[PDB]
Design an enzyme around this catalytic site. Structure first.
Site, PDB file in Angstrom:
ATOM      1  N   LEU A  12       0.840  -1.208   0.000  1.00  0.00           N
ATOM      2  CA  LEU A  12       0.000   0.000   0.000  1.00  0.00           C
ATOM      3  C   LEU A  12       0.871   1.253   0.000  1.00  0.00           C
ATOM      4  CD1 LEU A  12      -3.439  -0.249   1.739  1.00  0.00           C
ATOM      5  CD2 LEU A  12      -2.617  -0.528  -0.636  1.00  0.00           C
TER       6      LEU A  12
ATOM      7  N   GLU B  95      -8.306   6.023   7.101  1.00  0.00           N
ATOM      8  CA  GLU B  95      -8.924   5.243   6.010  1.00  0.00           C
ATOM      9  C   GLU B  95      -8.984   3.797   6.566  1.00  0.00           C
ATOM     10  OE1 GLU B  95      -7.914   2.300   3.896  1.00  0.00           O
ATOM     11  OE2 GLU B  95     -10.006   2.566   3.354  1.00  0.00           O
TER      12      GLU B  95
HETATM   13  N1  LIG Z   1      -6.568  -1.382  -2.102  1.00  0.00           N
HETATM   14  C1  LIG Z   1      -6.774  -2.473  -1.347  1.00  0.00           C
HETATM   15  O1  LIG Z   1      -7.687  -2.571  -0.544  1.00  0.00           O
HETATM   16  C2  LIG Z   1      -5.899  -3.683  -1.413  1.00  0.00           C
HETATM   17  C3  LIG Z   1      -4.867  -3.719  -2.262  1.00  0.00           C
HETATM   18  N2  LIG Z   1      -4.062  -4.897  -2.279  1.00  0.00           N
HETATM   19  C4  LIG Z   1      -2.820  -5.049  -3.172  1.00  0.00           C
HETATM   20  O2  LIG Z   1      -2.988  -6.090  -4.179  1.00  0.00           O
HETATM   21  C5  LIG Z   1      -1.614  -6.579  -4.493  1.00  0.00           C
HETATM   22  C6  LIG Z   1      -1.635  -8.099  -4.344  1.00  0.00           C
HETATM   23  O3  LIG Z   1      -2.532  -8.406  -5.438  1.00  0.00           O
HETATM   24  P1  LIG Z   1      -2.534  -9.799  -5.851  1.00  0.00           P
HETATM   25  O4  LIG Z   1      -1.158  -9.917  -6.332  1.00  0.00           O
HETATM   26  O5  LIG Z   1      -3.551 -10.202  -6.747  1.00  0.00           O
HETATM   27  O6  LIG Z   1      -2.546 -10.489  -4.421  1.00  0.00           O
HETATM   28  P2  LIG Z   1      -3.683 -11.213  -3.623  1.00  0.00           P
HETATM   29  O7  LIG Z   1      -3.558 -10.797  -2.192  1.00  0.00           O
HETATM   30  O8  LIG Z   1      -4.967 -11.351  -4.300  1.00  0.00           O
HETATM   31  O9  LIG Z   1      -2.879 -12.704  -3.594  1.00  0.00           O
HETATM   32  C7  LIG Z   1      -3.087 -13.532  -4.810  1.00  0.00           C
HETATM   33  C8  LIG Z   1      -2.648 -14.932  -4.295  1.00  0.00           C
HETATM   34  O10 LIG Z   1      -3.562 -15.355  -3.540  1.00  0.00           O
HETATM   35  C9  LIG Z   1      -4.210 -16.569  -3.956  1.00  0.00           C
HETATM   36  N3  LIG Z   1      -5.371 -16.338  -4.788  1.00  0.00           N
HETATM   37  C10 LIG Z   1      -5.892 -15.120  -5.071  1.00  0.00           C
HETATM   38  N4  LIG Z   1      -6.932 -15.182  -5.867  1.00  0.00           N
HETATM   39  C11 LIG Z   1      -7.008 -16.606  -6.081  1.00  0.00           C
HETATM   40  C12 LIG Z   1      -7.975 -17.510  -6.910  1.00  0.00           C
HETATM   41  N5  LIG Z   1      -8.961 -16.931  -7.598  1.00  0.00           N
HETATM   42  N6  LIG Z   1      -7.766 -18.844  -6.886  1.00  0.00           N
HETATM   43  C13 LIG Z   1      -6.723 -19.231  -6.133  1.00  0.00           C
HETATM   44  N7  LIG Z   1      -5.842 -18.577  -5.403  1.00  0.00           N
HETATM   45  C14 LIG Z   1      -6.072 -17.243  -5.423  1.00  0.00           C
HETATM   46  C15 LIG Z   1      -3.027 -17.188  -4.751  1.00  0.00           C
HETATM   47  O11 LIG Z   1      -2.055 -17.518  -3.852  1.00  0.00           O
HETATM   48  P3  LIG Z   1      -0.957 -18.772  -4.306  1.00  0.00           P
HETATM   49  O12 LIG Z   1       0.271 -18.052  -4.692  1.00  0.00           O
HETATM   50  O13 LIG Z   1      -1.079 -19.628  -3.144  1.00  0.00           O
HETATM   51  O14 LIG Z   1      -1.653 -19.321  -5.541  1.00  0.00           O
HETATM   52  C16 LIG Z   1      -2.682 -15.929  -5.585  1.00  0.00           C
HETATM   53  O15 LIG Z   1      -1.232 -15.873  -5.989  1.00  0.00           O
HETATM   54  C17 LIG Z   1      -0.615  -5.809  -3.580  1.00  0.00           C
HETATM   55  O16 LIG Z   1      -0.231  -4.574  -4.261  1.00  0.00           O
HETATM   56  C18 LIG Z   1      -1.584  -5.521  -2.381  1.00  0.00           C
HETATM   57  O17 LIG Z   1      -1.056  -4.520  -1.597  1.00  0.00           O
HETATM   58  C19 LIG Z   1      -4.329  -5.986  -1.447  1.00  0.00           C
HETATM   59  C20 LIG Z   1      -5.342  -6.001  -0.602  1.00  0.00           C
HETATM   60  C21 LIG Z   1      -6.280  -4.844  -0.449  1.00  0.00           C
HETATM   61  C1  LIG Z   2      -3.615  -4.430   2.595  1.00  0.00           C
HETATM   62  N1  LIG Z   2      -4.873  -4.498   3.375  1.00  0.00           N
HETATM   63  C2  LIG Z   2      -6.052  -3.969   2.662  1.00  0.00           C
HETATM   64  C3  LIG Z   2      -6.566  -2.586   2.886  1.00  0.00           C
HETATM   65  C4  LIG Z   2      -6.040  -1.489   3.442  1.00  0.00           C
HETATM   66  O1  LIG Z   2      -6.810  -0.521   3.450  1.00  0.00           O
HETATM   67  C5  LIG Z   2      -7.865  -0.836   2.903  1.00  0.00           C
HETATM   68  N2  LIG Z   2      -8.908  -0.009   2.754  1.00  0.00           N
HETATM   69  C6  LIG Z   2      -9.942  -0.594   2.138  1.00  0.00           C
HETATM   70  N3  LIG Z   2     -10.989   0.184   1.928  1.00  0.00           N
HETATM   71  N4  LIG Z   2      -9.947  -1.820   1.746  1.00  0.00           N
HETATM   72  C7  LIG Z   2      -8.952  -2.611   1.880  1.00  0.00           C
HETATM   73  N5  LIG Z   2      -9.011  -3.874   1.453  1.00  0.00           N
HETATM   74  C8  LIG Z   2      -7.880  -2.097   2.487  1.00  0.00           C
HETATM   75  C9  LIG Z   2      -4.857  -4.406   4.708  1.00  0.00           C
HETATM   76  C10 LIG Z   2      -3.680  -4.234   5.337  1.00  0.00           C
HETATM   77  C11 LIG Z   2      -3.580  -4.098   6.669  1.00  0.00           C
HETATM   78  C12 LIG Z   2      -4.683  -4.129   7.445  1.00  0.00           C
HETATM   79  C13 LIG Z   2      -4.643  -3.981   8.780  1.00  0.00           C
HETATM   80  O2  LIG Z   2      -3.646  -4.149   9.460  1.00  0.00           O
HETATM   81  N6  LIG Z   2      -5.755  -3.622   9.474  1.00  0.00           N
HETATM   82  C14 LIG Z   2      -5.535  -4.019  10.907  1.00  0.00           C
HETATM   83  C15 LIG Z   2      -4.568  -3.000  11.540  1.00  0.00           C
HETATM   84  C16 LIG Z   2      -5.111  -2.090  12.648  1.00  0.00           C
HETATM   85  C17 LIG Z   2      -4.701  -0.650  12.469  1.00  0.00           C
HETATM   86  O3  LIG Z   2      -3.779  -0.368  11.714  1.00  0.00           O
HETATM   87  O4  LIG Z   2      -5.316   0.213  13.075  1.00  0.00           O
HETATM   88  C18 LIG Z   2      -6.877  -4.196  11.555  1.00  0.00           C
HETATM   89  O5  LIG Z   2      -6.991  -4.763  12.637  1.00  0.00           O
HETATM   90  O6  LIG Z   2      -7.926  -3.849  11.012  1.00  0.00           O
HETATM   91  C19 LIG Z   2      -5.877  -4.276   6.817  1.00  0.00           C
HETATM   92  C20 LIG Z   2      -5.948  -4.428   5.489  1.00  0.00           C
END
Ligand SMILES: NC(=O)C1=CN([C@@H]2O[C@H](COP(=O)(O)OP(=O)(O)OC[C@H]3O[C@@H](n4cnc5c(N)ncnc54)[C@H](OP(=O)(O)O)[C@@H]3O)[C@@H](O)[C@H]2O)C=CC1
Ligand SMILES: CN(Cc1coc2nc(N)nc(N)c12)c1ccc(C(=O)N[C@@H](CCC(=O)O)C(=O)O)cc1
Length: 206
Positions: free
Chosen positions: A25, A32
């Protein structure tokens, strides 16, 4: 036994659908992240007794959760992983896919459990967002929009806010959001150490 409840997706993305950068991130949005926490933990008081929410995440998001904050507290976490060799957690499930995850919970958390589920959330990342988007039970997008072009390496799979999808996906009244989230939320933009952002609720008819 597979799909009963809805699927909610929750993300923080920039105007250009960027959701991450270098498997991380690229922004510190501490309030947020409180929205997040808030949203993903919220259970109606009367239900606050037996009920819990579920947070679904891909393997990579899991690695992105500070050891400090893992597993998410007050929520059932389920890491989607094919490449499950051995997950490491004391009640932190590992499903091979999104529907497998969904029959594990349904299997592991039914009528015979003193622990129920209210809401299920897909909390990321990219690939897990993709499969959530094609799943016939996904009808709500809890998205946070940052009005800053932050260089991201990973993008959100469906351009849901764009005109091409504007017959499916509708952005609900601020009212609807708050009610859903049960608690009042900031209306308008929130500036927090450089980025301009805002909360939205998108919904679709299944
Ligand atoms: N803005 C936001 O809220 C968020 C943003 N992000 C960002 O997304 C990025 C990671 O994205 P991404 O790379 O896709 O990572 P994901 O966290 O989605 O991890 C993908 C891994 O998880 C498993 N997986 C996910 N989807 C599937 C499926 N459909 N079937 C099977 N296994 C699945 C597999 O693990 P395996 O390798 O075991 O197959 C795949 O390699 C980072 O930049 C992260 O920070 C992440 C979370 C929230
Ligand atoms: C990379 N992700 C996804 C993430 C971050 O922000 C987002 N915001 C939205 N709207 N959606 C998401 N999926 C995320 C995450 C990473 C860390 C925590 C996390 O640590 N949250 C803890 C930390 C507590 C804290 O930092 O206060 C918790 O208990 O909720 C959550 C999500």
């Amino acid at each position: 036994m597979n799909q009963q409840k809805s699927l909610t997706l929750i993300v923080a993305l920039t105007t250009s659908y960027g959701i991450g950068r270098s498997n991380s991130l690229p922004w510190k949005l501490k309030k947020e992240i409180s929205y997040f926490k808030r949203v993903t933990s919220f259970v109606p008081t009367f239900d606050s007794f037996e009920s819990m929410n579920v947070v679904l995440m891909g393997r990579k998001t899991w690695e992105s959760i500070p050891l400090q904050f893992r597993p998410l507290k007050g929520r059932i976490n389920v890491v989607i992983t094919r490449n499950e060799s051995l997950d490491l957690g004391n009640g932190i499930h590992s499903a091979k896919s999104l529907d497998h995850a969904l029959e594990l919970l349904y299997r592991t958390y039914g009528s015979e459990s003193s622990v129920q589920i209210n809401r299920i959330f897909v909390i990321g990342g990219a690939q897990l967002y993709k499969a959530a988007m094609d799943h016939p039970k996904l009808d709500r997008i809890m998205a946070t929009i940052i009005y800053k072009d932050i260089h991201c390496d990973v993008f959100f799979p469906l351009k849901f806010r764009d005109k091409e999808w504007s017959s499916v996906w509708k952005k609900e009244k601020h009212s609807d959001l708050e009610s859903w989230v049960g608690t009042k939320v900031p209306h308008g933009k929130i500036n927090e150490d450089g980025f301009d952002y805002e909360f939205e609720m998108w919904t679709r008819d299944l």
